[PDB]
Design a protein around this ligand. Sequence first.
Ligand code: MAN
Ligand code: MAN
Ligand code: MAN
Ligand code: MAN
Ligand code: ZN
Ligand code: ZN
Ligand code: ZN
Ligand code: ZN
Ligand code: ZN
Ligand code: ZN
Ligand code: ZN
Ligand code: ZN
Ligand code: ZN
Ligand code: ZN
Ligand code: ZN
Ligand code: ZN
Ligand code: ZN
Ligand code: ZN
Ligand code: ZN
Ligand code: ZN
Ligand code: ZN
Lengths: 302, 302, 302, 302
Amino acid sequence: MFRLTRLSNKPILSPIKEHEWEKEAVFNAAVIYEGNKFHLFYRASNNKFVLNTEKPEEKYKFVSSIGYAVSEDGINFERFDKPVLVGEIPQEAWGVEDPRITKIDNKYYMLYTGFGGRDWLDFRICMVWSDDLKNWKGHRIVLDEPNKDAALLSEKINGKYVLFHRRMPDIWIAYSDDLVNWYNHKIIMSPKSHTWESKKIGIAGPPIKREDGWLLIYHGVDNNNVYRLGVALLDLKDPSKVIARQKEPILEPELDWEINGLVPNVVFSCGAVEVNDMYYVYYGAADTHIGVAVIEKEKVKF
Amino acid sequence: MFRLTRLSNKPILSPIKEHEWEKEAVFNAAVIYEGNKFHLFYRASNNKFVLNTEKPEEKYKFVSSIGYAVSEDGINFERFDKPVLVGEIPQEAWGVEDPRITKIDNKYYMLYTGFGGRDWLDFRICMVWSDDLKNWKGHRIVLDEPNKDAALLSEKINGKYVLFHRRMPDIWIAYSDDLVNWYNHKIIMSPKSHTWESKKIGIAGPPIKREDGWLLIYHGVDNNNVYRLGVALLDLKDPSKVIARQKEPILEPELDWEINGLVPNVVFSCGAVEVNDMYYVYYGAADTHIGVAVIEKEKVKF
Amino acid sequence: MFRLTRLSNKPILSPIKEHEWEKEAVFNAAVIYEGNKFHLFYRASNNKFVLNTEKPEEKYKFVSSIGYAVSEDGINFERFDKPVLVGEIPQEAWGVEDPRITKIDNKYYMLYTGFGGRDWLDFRICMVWSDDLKNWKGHRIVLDEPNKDAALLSEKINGKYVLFHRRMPDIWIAYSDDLVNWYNHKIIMSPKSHTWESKKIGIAGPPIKREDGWLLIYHGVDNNNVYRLGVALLDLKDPSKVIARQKEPILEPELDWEINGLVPNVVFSCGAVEVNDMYYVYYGAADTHIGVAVIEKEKVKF
Amino acid sequence: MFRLTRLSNKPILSPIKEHEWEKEAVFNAAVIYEGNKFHLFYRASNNKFVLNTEKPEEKYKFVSSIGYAVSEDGINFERFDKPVLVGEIPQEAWGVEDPRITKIDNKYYMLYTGFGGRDWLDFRICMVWSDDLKNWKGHRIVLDEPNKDAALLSEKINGKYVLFHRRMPDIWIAYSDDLVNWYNHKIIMSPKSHTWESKKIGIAGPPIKREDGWLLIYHGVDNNNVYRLGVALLDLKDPSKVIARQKEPILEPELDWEINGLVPNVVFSCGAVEVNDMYYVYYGAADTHIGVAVIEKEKVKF
Ligand SMILES: OC[C@H]1O[C@H](O)[C@@H](O)[C@@H](O)[C@@H]1O
Ligand SMILES: OC[C@H]1O[C@H](O)[C@@H](O)[C@@H](O)[C@@H]1O
Ligand SMILES: OC[C@H]1O[C@H](O)[C@@H](O)[C@@H](O)[C@@H]1O
Ligand SMILES: OC[C@H]1O[C@H](O)[C@@H](O)[C@@H](O)[C@@H]1O
Ligand SMILES: [Zn+2]
Ligand SMILES: [Zn+2]
Ligand SMILES: [Zn+2]
Ligand SMILES: [Zn+2]
Ligand SMILES: [Zn+2]
Ligand SMILES: [Zn+2]
Ligand SMILES: [Zn+2]
Ligand SMILES: [Zn+2]
Ligand SMILES: [Zn+2]
Ligand SMILES: [Zn+2]
Ligand SMILES: [Zn+2]
Ligand SMILES: [Zn+2]
Ligand SMILES: [Zn+2]
Ligand SMILES: [Zn+2]
Ligand SMILES: [Zn+2]
Ligand SMILES: [Zn+2]
Ligand SMILES: [Zn+2]
């Protein structure tokens, strides 16, 4: 088995109480590595996360925003006073969550969860895109259904866009001619009962192309809602086929700010990039902080 | 197949009309047996409990206080003219409810529900502690979320403090290194459909240590909001594991002042202590009075 | 140790398919003995009773009406083309159920359940009255709450009217000065676990005055929703006190048309009169037909 | 604990494109072992299943038929050109579903869900019978209510026909003297929260008589609508009494044609037979194909 190794025993991004939109939490962050820079797009919450109510209650409302941070070494990030993305329509009344960014041809696609807070199924995969990672346009509901953990493949298979999504509790794949209509939905990977990944699974960041397949980092949730990261390999030509899947996780809550926090016992990645023959996996921790762990790509064997 | 036996067919503590803070109800009492004396910390209400309005309304406002009473024989108590704990404004503006007190090493921890009355979900588990059952301090919100039916285990498990709580409608467990931050949340016990405990369950008093495990008295609520008491046995080394659970209740409303009162059909315990090879279980009755019922320790078997 | 004896092995009243309002069911009938005639006011349903849906569904809507029938011998009844009372639309959209008629000071009070059908709790005790059993008037919601199984006592107690009602699952008593406002609500009788009357109880017909107390026939419901009739005796001067209660039912489904029907396994009385020192107990059978059973006044011994 | 073992990693029956009535799905099959042959009566659909519309839409109409197939070995089946049961119009306009066939005293009773498609509650338990498995007659609505998952016991109990049915979400039992009118309704088994069988349960095929009880294979539905097979044992003399119930499933969606199909994540049995000390469990897979799994009888242990 292989596993990620943290670069810091402390977060690389933490909430800023002076900033309302990231007052309580910064986590679950998309990343792409473009101009020799790490472009990090992080979920941020103005509030703690009451989840145990029958419906989302306005008195316990939290608002998710996406922030931007940039770094050259992967560790130290420059941050900004304001978020780059917020919810603007009622379906995103409780904000925009867990972004995954994929570059296809020469455009960047950010897939996030729009949460409206009207009930606990009131969340949708949404998409905006940009030429430049700065000006997001063309907001759309990707699937009109309670769904999340969505990512696009960085290229087309047989001329089709590929979407990973997550009809509970499985990782699903779907295909599109036009990034509008999705078809040939199917389950590509399922939880394993009586294990750390028993309750549900979902893609982590967008799959990373390798020579032996597409690297599929994913999160698994156990019966007590611990989020841990696992890893699987998709067939290179047919990313609907899992060709390998590591039995044990590659990241689990270990440090205090991963075990303890707003949502205890969570590590969760929305983004990972290949940089200098290493995979940089940025992860939310306890839905409160962002850490980063790496693995030399040479060590990724199944 | 065992039951509690009421020590009296009359309440042992009743409201005092002359005391505003306990004019209408005394009930749901934490219990500690120290210095050959029963220490009762009882919920007290200045008012009946109108609960069927959309929001808590000032004209139906009730305020819970924690009063204190002490007894050598368990039946006759010395009472006090003012309560020993009242709610801070505004988070506990409608008062402090259902204390459970746990002695860990040489400190006493009182967990109770702070109710702010700003919404019907405006309640949370709070904690105060004392080394003497007299000077309570160090107030903190245990879980910042709508939650109640909370109690500490009387000792640490693998070096962690153990919290029992109640995200609706199950009995949960959680662990802490510092009595501030809780993690490893786990459901340990659930309602049982089509039984007296179908709607919801919650811990009673803190679990009593035995050689065969932890005695976990609890309350079950049926479809008609009748509150009864039941018993389970937790594993001694992992109290998250229920190793036995009696099907039948050990106490149910039977006497007129358990069936009739401010909230009909309630027996509810927030404390039970081992004295002279007997379990003394103090219980609110109809959210109006306090009774006491016992079981010979030898009769506790599953 | 005592039981009712069916007068007839035949329903004394059955639905009439050609009459929409009583096409499927005649049952749960109020009865008054006046002018040496049995005056039966029976619940009639246009439809079968689909009760297993999560909510009442318009497609399975049933409409209860109240018909009149009159007999001189209490066995053979004359009937009429049209109901005497109908649910006013929409507040009683699914009709008017289970009438209980009490005579007080030459006025007849009919208490019935108005059912709006908007959810399964959309029911309440309504009351009309008359001084001739023909011209019903004065409709009012007796208690603004989900409630049923209501009857008035046939005289005042210490100057106050007496209402029996049924906040689930118990028989309740309440008092009024004006037949509009009720106070001093109190449970007087409860189901008994692990018996034929375990799930709930409710009053049957209005209590019958005796020299030794108030005869309180009631229905009890077991864990499988079988309806049987029990009997208790209320203190003559304080009918809040049950002074006797028979362990075993006095009537239970035995005949095919009591065991089988629109609601299987039901006998249910809303009406019982004393005629020549016999109690004539009229009963719905399987919510489909009406039977009559009797017991000599002298054999009512507890 | 024990598990079924699939006889093939491929379906034993699959849709047949040139037969419209079974063009898209063959699944949920009744089975009878007579004349040393497996007689399979399988549900068949002319269409994919759109189930998430607000009402059953003509534009997505599917029609279920019952096809017949026969096999010597239980694996290789001869099939036929026409279905053997189709729905009456209009109450069964969307066809006849999920047959369970019980032999009682030289008569064969097929219980199925008749679905009329007029709304999503427009289904009911229907029954036909034959003495030859070929000439089905005596159509009747078994319970005139939204209900399904029905099967008859292969014997009477104290002279009574025994019906298993499923008022949501439990397995119910009921009894009849005439195969027309049903009474003594009783819940016998219920879903279990926070398990694979939390949402609802329903009988699989008719229970199989054993020396130690009736084998009740059933299906359990989790919170994500995954269908799995479980197994319980009913008391031999009193099959309303569950005397054992395995915690783990005996069969779960595992193969791709069980996980992906017209309805994902479904294994479902309507029939199982004992041949030569093995139970053959026929199961629909993803509401699309039919597989068959077995368990040696010796290994069936509670
Ligand atoms: O998407 C709504 C909600 O779903 C889950 O509860 C978590 O992923 C939350 O962080 C999220 O906000
Ligand atoms: O906790 C707030 C409120 O919760 C419930 O409604 C009851 O337990 C009340 O007694 C309590 O005051
Ligand atoms: O009152 C609503 C409804 O309640 C019960 O289900 C039965 O008594 C029905 O006959 C009645 O219509
Ligand atoms: O019963 C009607 C309809 O409802 C269910 O959800 C499914 O089993 C369908 O296959 C069936 O046709
Ligand atoms: Zn700033
Ligand atoms: Zn959106
Ligand atoms: Zn996820
Ligand atoms: Zn005083
Ligand atoms: Zn507090
Ligand atoms: Zn639960
Ligand atoms: Zn509780
Ligand atoms: Zn019981
Ligand atoms: Zn006529
Ligand atoms: Zn009315
Ligand atoms: Zn009733
Ligand atoms: Zn009998
Ligand atoms: Zn053909
Ligand atoms: Zn039919
Ligand atoms: Zn149920
Ligand atoms: Zn089912
Ligand atoms: Zn399992």
